[PDB]
């Protein structure tokens, strides 16, 4: 998780003050937005990959998600190892305030963990601004079906 | 145990919540109502003057509620209990003092009762204010009741908190196709009016209104706004450089070709093109019909006697929309709490009461007109005895209005439905849960998902958990544990003080500046336009935090849009937190220890400048921390108790963060449907429908919130063992399995109480 | 993609949102025809290549001065030298403005003269000024934008958003034999009937074969037949 | 305000059409909650 | 280190300050241009001061248009609205000490024409209830006629306030 | 053109002068404007062929490129490039 | 599928509270630790978790 | 960089305003205008603070210091003499500077 942070921090310091090759996804700031979305994605799945692999036999959630009962390997992975990238609307947590997610974060927030990202599982608990982000996606998906 | 920095921060909430109760809203507003509003409304019309007879005049000197002479109060005012049993309403008499004058040349006085009026529970004028123990046992009623509700005509109903869009403020929205639109709404006394600015085509912009028939070429309007010189206008709404010139230059071009001046065709255009004249005393007709128009119908509150104030304001209103016409974004959407303001029932009752009083006036004036047109024996009285039997129109009129929920206004003429709601009593939570709940009105469609999903700005000012899953989703919210609703202070003593701080009058300023720094806006109105924002902000906040004007009137800087805002307009949520000066907190140990032991209570920290309230768009400018450990000394403020984010109803769930938001939402709805023991007076109380529990028990795992709200004293549920296993096969999907002889010693044993009412009447026979 | 797209089909409305059109060109190559047919069919480069637009008044003559920079037309491929924009300039003249005169001297400078409520000439020219850097030099009046994308494994081709169809199919440089277009109702206006019925059952099957399950081939064909 | 007595009662093709119009008269019926069992064969 | 003394002068008829947004800076050695010929009209409070400035026949006068519509040929007309705000003083430095004379009321100057309102009329031609705006209008047009002769010279403007120390 | 007339300082519009002259004057105010008005707003492959480009050039060497364009029956279009000047050339 | 781990922890914190004869606290973002409950259990002869 | 940019101007302004104050010294007519808070509690006067700073003040234990002004370069200003409603209109000539004074701690 930490090795996936400063790498994006190295990419984001080149955002305003530097130049980089941009995909034909049109204009700027969407370029790294697709990159930060791709990087943190793989890292998430990768962390949860080794988790279930080394998990002990005869356990209930594995066997239950193994056969017919309930859920999938993706579900139990969020319980134990890590969650990540809560996303509504097709993008990342649009700013409620001016150029910032929450007042608890510095102005111009491009930082990972500052927007729609949580490195904590359901077991370990949730940091205070790891919560509201999850409340969003929960509210969004709930009103959707309704 | 020694006093640490972590322990005391949690002790702050009990000190805060003990002074101001869980429900501030209804109480505080009703108390302000019966004193301030009552004396102000009667001051609006203190006189009634009718035409006949050589001279007649009548003056109301003072109006009070159920208090005069040596009597502290009514001999015996019916308690809440007995009032509920006899189906009678809950009310106190209205005492008035009037001065009567006849053609017998007399000046005298008296004390009369114009009618009744409902009194809310737990109020200064109630019998339950500051009472303890045996006082309640004698009055036959429960000490733990939340209060703050109106009981009339049998059962009891509650006035629900209603949200309202921003009043007297500029809001700008952008649209595909046609163009950009900004809306302006306000109310001055009797009437409410809405202005709509619009750009149809060409970049040349128009002004729509219900007063003026056809859209006016604003460049002509601005001429009628007192300005002549043209390019001064361009240098105002556009100013110095870039692309802002050519766009507005189009309208500027073709406006002055056919008709150009600041006087002659300016007014005469508007007045000839203007709609219906109201038919009475109409002919002032001249360039002056637009004069009274260019003041009153001039689209906003500004007015007064000059053309300079209003002009620049409309120009600055034109300033912003031409900026978003250039490129997308750069606008203000209407979603978040920052642009929203909630209004407590205190103002609503005043609006409804003043209407019935106005209706009485003309009828009372015409009442004496009868004998007035009668030939002989001019009458001294019967303005006493006859109006007494003529009265009670206020009584029944207000009682029917509060019972129905349909309010009829002849002034604003706004008929509002679905205001009052009957308080649902099932458990102890449902009573406290329905209160402290934010409702909403209109804003059109069910289809639009815009005003539905939660927004990050809601954090800490509202409950992010509680919500009534169903047809209505997200349209009704709830307040958090620690919040404060803003009142209104005053206007005049700010400007004069602001001038002392070095800001100057807008009149003396040559009006062609987009160039020097920011400018100070008072409730949206440009006044000072001062340099050096730093010393302006800091010193002003210092005068706030320390010796004067606490709570509201907060100042915040605007970086991109160039200005500095000062808003004194109340009716908004406020949240407490702690100031960190330099690198460390302002609290510092031994202070809070002096608190918990013997003294120092609350609201003293505001005097010492420790804790205060952020608000409005100022919460955006500041910087808030999480924990005392996390502090990096770039921080303006820290936060006290981060777990206050959830509402009062959502504080029941143990380990909420371990779960997911959809699970916590369902519990908030089901948690109030649980069956408790309700109150202590419960056995002496006759309800319409009620469910009871036999052997209630507290939860094995408690919460810090449930103790402060007094939950476990009146718990709802049965603490029981359990096992997680696949057994039965009558279990399977979402179905449990119970055990006999556990249930035969009883489990969750209930009781169902209903009632029936009959009346023996008497006909005309 | 999802259900509101099926709504667009079932309703069979005239217009529709982002109606992309697929077309094949010749073969798979990076240069020439790839970017050639790309710069051929869309909008107006007039406001782009215009360099600087000058407005001059000398003595008794009124002058509109637009001098085109040759640098852009060289890099961005459009087929003409000067006169074909001059006939495109007179197209604009014939459409919304006037038929008077046109001038050609050097560096692609085009002069416009006008002459006859008082002082109308100034107000006339004022409107003709701003309206000039708009009108289409080449391409059609349809396409909102185009894209060159990698087709299949290694191949290349383009997709176009517009109501054009036949005209861009008639447009030289591309093979129009095998193509496709959305909003079936308009396909009925060119191929018609059968081919349109074959297209409407093609899109219905596609978009509903992605999100999940199966609707089977049988039930779809009957739905498109009873309509057609 | 509206007193409309004729063309109206023939209307109401939406909202409560599901409940009132076609759901008013159905005889010999019943309703109750649900609960599982292994022992009952299907059908 | 040192000391700069300042004083506060007395009443002395008070003052009224002119300002106009028309003329910009000429960027030359002397930026300001001096208005002339005076001819101001006056009335009671909210007086609407009128400013008159000459017109030159030498440069770009366009005579053929004048003889046709407005025969004016003459001094330009400017007007403006006066306003007052407390706590504003004026200053002038004499020797090593500073002296200060309070300004009082302030006024803005922007023009208009009677060649308009009179021309608009001649082109077109061939009780208890009121307050505020029009009350400042109906009374305005009626009560204003005053001829003020502006004469500029200064001697005692200092010594009058100076001896008050 | 967005001009203005000192003193009154409103705007300057073009008015047609009598008999051949074009002038401009401020509305409602006497004035005349003489002058000119203005405004402005803003390689391996080789083949043998004769080079049409001539300064001193007269170059023998050239480059060529091959692609099929337009219709299938429509012949091949070739693109010539010169060594010395580096000029691109196109003919079918 | 419903994915709530907060309930499964409640039993341990609840069971440990009864053995000590004390009501066990819990709250969002903090509160009584799960680990100390295990050692409170295991010394009385119960398996550490549940 | 909030405090930075402002203190940079405060230094400069406290110098520049001192020059144009002493640049117009002798008899030729040059005028400046002041803005002060009301109620006028009582006087003390202006002068350069130690180490080149600038501090105004009044007497009897009070310190009031402020300088600078909002952007100039438009205004053509002169105050005129009006008395008794009788014809006066006396022009003292031109204007030079502008300054405001804010109180402080
Ligand atoms: Zn002019």
Swiss-Prot record, chain A:
It is found in: Nucleus. Transmembrane segments: none annotated. Residues 128-140 are annotated as: Bridging helix. It comes from the Eukaryota. Component of the RNA polymerase III (Pol III) complex consisting of 17 subunits. Belongs to the RNA polymerase beta' chain family. Present with 6020 molecules/cell in log phase SD medium. DNA-dependent RNA polymerase catalyzes the transcription of DNA into RNA using the four ribonucleoside triphosphates as substrates. Largest and catalytic core component of RNA polymerase III which synthesizes small RNAs, such as 5S rRNA and tRNAs. Forms the polymerase active center together with the second largest subunit. A single-stranded DNA template strand of the promoter is positioned within the central active site cleft of Pol III. This is DNA-directed RNA polymerase III subunit RPC1. It comes from Saccharomyces cerevisiae (strain ATCC 204508 / S288c) (Baker's yeast).
UniProtKB/Swiss-Prot annotation, chain B:
Keywords: DNA-directed RNA polymerase, Metal-binding, Nucleotidyltransferase, Nucleus, Transcription, Transferase, Zinc, Zinc-finger. It catalyses: RNA(n) + a ribonucleoside 5'-triphosphate = RNA(n+1) + diphosphate. GO terms for molecular function: DNA binding; DNA-directed RNA polymerase activity; ribonucleoside binding; zinc ion binding. GO terms for cellular component: mitochondrion; nucleoplasm; nucleus; RNA polymerase III complex. Its EC number is 2.7.7.6. The keyword Transferase applies. It is found in: Nucleus. It is an enzyme of class 2 (transferase). Signal peptide: none annotated. The keyword rRNA processing does not apply. GO terms for biological process: termination of RNA polymerase III transcription; transcription by RNA polymerase III; transcription initiation at RNA polymerase III promoter; tRNA transcription by RNA polymerase III. Component of the RNA polymerase III (Pol III) complex consisting of 17 subunits. Belongs to the RNA polymerase beta chain family. DNA-dependent RNA polymerase catalyzes the transcription of DNA into RNA using the four ribonucleoside triphosphates as substrates. Second largest core component of RNA polymerase III which synthesizes small RNAs, such as 5S rRNA and tRNAs. Proposed to contribute to the polymerase catalytic activity and forms the polymerase active center together with the largest subunit. Pol III is composed of mobile elements and RPC2 is part of the core element with the central large cleft and probably a clamp element that moves to open and close the cleft.
Swiss-Prot record, chain E:
Its main location: nucleus. It is found in: Nucleus. GO terms for cellular component: nucleus; RNA polymerase III complex. One of its GO terms (biological process) is transcription initiation at RNA polymerase III promoter. Keywords: DNA-directed RNA polymerase, Nucleus, Phosphoprotein, Transcription. It comes from the Eukaryota. Present with 1590 molecules/cell in log phase SD medium. DNA-dependent RNA polymerase catalyzes the transcription of DNA into RNA using the four ribonucleoside triphosphates as substrates. Specific peripheric component of RNA polymerase III which synthesizes small RNAs, such as 5S rRNA and tRNAs. The RPC53/RPC4-RPC37/RPC5 subcomplex is required for terminator recognition and reinitiation. Component of the RNA polymerase III (Pol III) complex consisting of 17 subunits. Interacts with RPC53/RPC4. RPC53/RPC4, RPC37/RPC5 and RPC11/RPC10 probably form a Pol III subcomplex. This is DNA-directed RNA polymerase III subunit RPC5. It comes from Saccharomyces cerevisiae (strain ATCC 204508 / S288c) (Baker's yeast). The gene is RPC37.
UniProtKB/Swiss-Prot annotation, chain H:
It is found in: Nucleus. Coiled coil: none annotated. It comes from the Eukaryota. Component of the RNA polymerase III (Pol III) complex consisting of 17 subunits. Interacts with RPC37/RPC5. RPC53/RPC4, RPC37/RPC5 and RPC11/RPC10 probably form a Pol III subcomplex. DNA-dependent RNA polymerase catalyzes the transcription of DNA into RNA using the four ribonucleoside triphosphates as substrates. Specific peripheric component of RNA polymerase III which synthesizes small RNAs, such as 5S rRNA and tRNAs. Essential for tRNA synthesis. The RPC53/RPC4-RPC37/RPC5 subcomplex is required for terminator recognition and reinitiation. Belongs to the eukaryotic RPC4/POLR3D RNA polymerase subunit family. Present with 998 molecules/cell in log phase SD medium. This is DNA-directed RNA polymerase III subunit RPC4. The gene is RPC53.
